[PDB]
Symmetry: D2
């Protein structure tokens, strides 16, 4: 039956495209998600390291204020 041979062909072409669409949309997906999961760990790197940098500076800023209030007194006695 040619109405069947050809129907067989339509269906198989449709299934071949459907498979291709879902393999493409999966690369789409696999790619959008690697980005999300990279972007996240990355802007988390940043508001972690930026934190521990601001802290290094707070400490240093305290050791350096300690040091000046010591000088400030010994200059009043000088």
């Amino acid at each position: 039956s040619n109405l069947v041979e050809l129907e067989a062909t339509r269906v198989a072409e449709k299934e071949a495209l459907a498979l291709l669409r879902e393999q493409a949309a999966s690369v789409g997906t696999q790619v959008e998600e690697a980005a999300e999961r990279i972007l996240k760990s990355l802007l988390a790197q940043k508001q972690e390291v930026l934190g521990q940098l601001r802290a290094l500076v707070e400490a240093a800023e305290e050791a350096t204020r300690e040091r000046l209030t010591k000088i400030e007194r010994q200059e009043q006695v000088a």
Copy 2:
């Protein structure tokens, strides 16, 4: 006194704090610039890639459109 020594200490201290602020803020920058370049070039990938899959699927889709038309007409005739 050596109020000359004390004052010279106050100012070596301030310069050493200042230098340390600059180095630290500068490290802040390198870090933000990394994350910015990385975000930009990941968003270029994502856009380029999706656009190339869009292509691949629409070419694929049009090869099918044609294939099915040879079938549509050959069923008129069958």
Copy 3:
């Protein structure tokens, strides 16, 4: 207490250079770990993506070959 704050001071100093390498080496560490984690996940993508593309091409190639096998037969009948 002649020399007691000429020491109580060096023990605030000793204790704060130390804090500062503990902060500085820990900052370089966060950068390192974040670089590893980001590569570890680019590579995961690259593999999972290269492989899903390979599978899309393989299925396409099999379809195409099924197409020519059909053509080649109707050429024996032609």
Copy 4:
């Protein structure tokens, strides 16, 4: 149909699979390359950041050193 519509379809089907092969290998290319940019820009970061950090520690040590050559002298006078 004819040997001639049959050869033309062989042909269009090769031009379709060829195209698909380009577009796909080229999505691969687009993925690999972004991954190399992100690697490069991480290296440049991990360079300049481990650099600037090393410097900041060697200035805060150059100056812990000065701060103790002074203490050592004032202890000889005490």
